[PDB]
């Protein structure tokens, strides 16, 4: 019948069935539909690094293709300030790819702008104790500015095994760089 699609673990799930059932059905399938990662890096968007201040410099636009889902991330150096686009709805994928964009923010000399505010009444990317959620937040708590949800953005692989089948790297080709597709370390 296939998995139910829960997000914490479908990665585990193909991982299981690729391993002991043998057919890489499952990856290869998750593969396509919500595991790119990566950081895509516009071609007319040249970064040159300072030594002095050991961070990077000029304009840059980032795409984080996460499947069907991908994230568009664009920084007005000029202006010190930054714009994300996505449309990942899930739990624990939105907060890799926001550990992901603040690593990118951290590199390029900026963090993440966050409001505290007992309510929006608009729809907000906020943090909870269980993680980052969509929606309109009625509770105090941390809102994180410049999140837009654009809904309107939404094949072969291979796969590399490690720990003995605990971790999974897929690419699009021999040539694509290397993204962690799977790996069954959740909670």
């Not at 479908?10 to 499952?26: E, T």
């Not at 996460?66 to 996505?86: M, V």
């Not at 605990?166 to 959740?186: G, K, N, T, Y």
Request: with cysteine; aromatic share 10%.
């Amino acid at each position: 019948v296939g998995v139910p699609p829960i997000d914490p673990e479908i990665q585990c799930a193909a991982l299981m069935i690729a391993d002991i059932k043998g057919d890489y059905s499952v990856l290869q399938l998750q593969a396509n539909r919500r595991a790119y990662s990566g950081k895509q890096y516009d071609a007319y968007c040249v970064q040159t690094y300072n030594e002095v201040t050991k961070l990077y410099e000029g304009d840059l636009r980032v795409t984080f293709n996460f499947g069907l889902d991908c994230a568009r991330l664009e920084i007005f150096w000029d202006k010190k300030a930054y714009i994300l686009e996505t449309s990942i709805t899930q739990k624990h994928v939105l907060k890799i790819m926001m550990d992901e964009v603040s690593k990118e923010l951290i590199k390029c000399g900026m963090r993440f702008n966050t409001e505290q505010v007992q309510g929006v009444r608009h729809m907000v990317l906020f943090k909870t104790e269980s993680g980052f959620e969509w929606g309109k937040p009625n509770i105090p708590c941390i809102v994180y500015k410049n999140c837009v949800l654009r809904t309107s953005l939404r094949h072969k692989f291979m796969i590399t095994i490690k720990d003995d089948g605990l971790r999974a790297i897929a690419q699009h080709d021999e040539d694509s760089p290397r993204f962690l597709l799977a790996h069954a370390f959740h909670t």
